[PDB]
Amino acid sequence: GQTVCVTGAAGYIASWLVKMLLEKGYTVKGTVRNPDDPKNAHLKALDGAAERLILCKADLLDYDAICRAVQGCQGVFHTASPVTDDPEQMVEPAVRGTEYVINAAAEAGTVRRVVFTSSIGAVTMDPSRGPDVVVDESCWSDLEFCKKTRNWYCYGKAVAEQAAWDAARQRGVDLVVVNPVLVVGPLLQPTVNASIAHVLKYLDGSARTFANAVQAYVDVRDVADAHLRVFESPAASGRYLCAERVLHREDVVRILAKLFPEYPVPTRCSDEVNPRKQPYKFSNQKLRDLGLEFRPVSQSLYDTVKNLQEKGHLP
Numbered sequence: 532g533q534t535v536c537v538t539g540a541a542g543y544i545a546s547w548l549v550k551m552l553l554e555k556g557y558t559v560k561g562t563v564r565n566p567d568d569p570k571n572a573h574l575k576a577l578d579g580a581a582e583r584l585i586l587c588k589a590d591l592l593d594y595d596a597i598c599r600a601v602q603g604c605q606g607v608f609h610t611a612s613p614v615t616d617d618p619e620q621m622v623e624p625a626v627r628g629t630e631y632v633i634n635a636a637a638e639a640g641t642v643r644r645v646v647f648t649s650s651i652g653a654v655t656m657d658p659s660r661g662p663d664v665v666v667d668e669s670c671w672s673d674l675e676f677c678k679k680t681r682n683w684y685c686y687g688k689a690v691a692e693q694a695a696w697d698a699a700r701q702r703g704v705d706l707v708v709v710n711p712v713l714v715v716g717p718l719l720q721p722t723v724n725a726s727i728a729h730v731l732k733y734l735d736g737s738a739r740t741f742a743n744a745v746q747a748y749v750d751v752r753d754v755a756d757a758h759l760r761v762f763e764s765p766a767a768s769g770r771y772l773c774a775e776r777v778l779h780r781e782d783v784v785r786i787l788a789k790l791f792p793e794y795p796v797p798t799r800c801s802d803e804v805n806p807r808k809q810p811y812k813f814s815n816q817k818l819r820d821l822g823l824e825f826r827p828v829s830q831s832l833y834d835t836v837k838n839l840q841e842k843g844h845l846p
């Protein structure tokens with residue numbers, strides 16, 4: 532019976548974090564732009580929301596608004612963040628917004644641990660990285676490479692994380708980070724987020740081809756579960772990579788064609804001339820060591836399409 536804060540509580544990954552929290556007798560203070568906007572309707576109907584959900588009005592760049600939500604809480608889950616390649620609304624709002632939380636939780640005075648939601652964008656983005664090496668928590672991105680290629684979401688997450696590590700040390704608050712990859716799964720929120728858009732663009736004919744690239748995948752519930760496990764585990768420390776497996780673009784559109792042949796999923800590749808990129812080795816032992824059984828991607832991709840259809844996003 533403790534109290535915790537979750538920023539951007541009505542987000543894709545966040546909405547699942549609240550459900551799990553509310554189900555274990557946690558009081559959840561959910562920061563949103565407007566507690567009475569319809570966007571948050573899907574939070575007031577959870578088993579424990581009426582009793583222990585409290586929607587706090589707060590922008591992420593409003594220091595005082597954060598302190599109001601963070602105050603009285605034993606833990607904080609900073610999930611809110613911009614998700615875009617526009618650096619003007621990504622980079623500084625992420626570092627300032629993140630530093631506000633650490634300070635606010637450090638400001639006063641019950642918080643034993645903060646959990647920041649970083650990204651894989653601050654891990655695997657380094658072309659100097661070898662093909663043989665296992666991508667683990669000690670892997671960081673080349674910030675110059677991100678800047679040269681306009682990868683500002685990956686940039687912002689890297690800086691926002693390192694800023695959180697600094698801010699945490701400077702103020703002496705317990706921090707532990709979770710690095711989810713491209714997340715996918717059932718949507719609780721009524722709107723389509725950025726990661727689902729990468730999945731949905733195959734199923735609505737937005738794409739007639741798929742790129743010659745690779746990427747890691749994880750279920751949204753595996754993420755929400757990770758944040759909760761890394762928080763409750765006392766000895767939990769450092770970063771925590773959160774992924775199930777690495778797939779090629781081809782392997783993805785195959786799984787979707789497999790279970791959904793009535794949709795116009797791509798079959799042809801954008802390259803077809805250079806050798807297809809092979810998936811990279813990675814480690815998710817830190818989360819597994821905490822007793823986390825990852826849901827298969829294929830199983831998670833299915834619940835997504837079934838969810839999107841039920842909610843009108845797909846015919």
Ligand SMILES: NC(=O)c1ccc[n+]([C@@H]2O[C@H](COP(=O)([O-])OP(=O)(O)OC[C@H]3O[C@@H](n4cnc5c(N)ncnc54)[C@H](OP(=O)(O)O)[C@@H]3O)[C@@H](O)[C@H]2O)c1
Binds near residue numbers: 611650
């Ligand atoms: N989903 C993934 O695949 C993935 C992978 C790696 C890391 N992450 C990170 O996980 C966290 C949540 O991701 P997500 O999938 O849940 O994305 P999301 O649902 O689309 O956005 C999360 C929430 O953050 C809010 N937000 C952003 N800027 C804000 C601001 N200045 N003030 C108040 N609220 C703000 C958003 O509100 P608005 O919609 O109104 O802007 C949204 O409700 C993020 O840090 C994300 O970068 C996600």
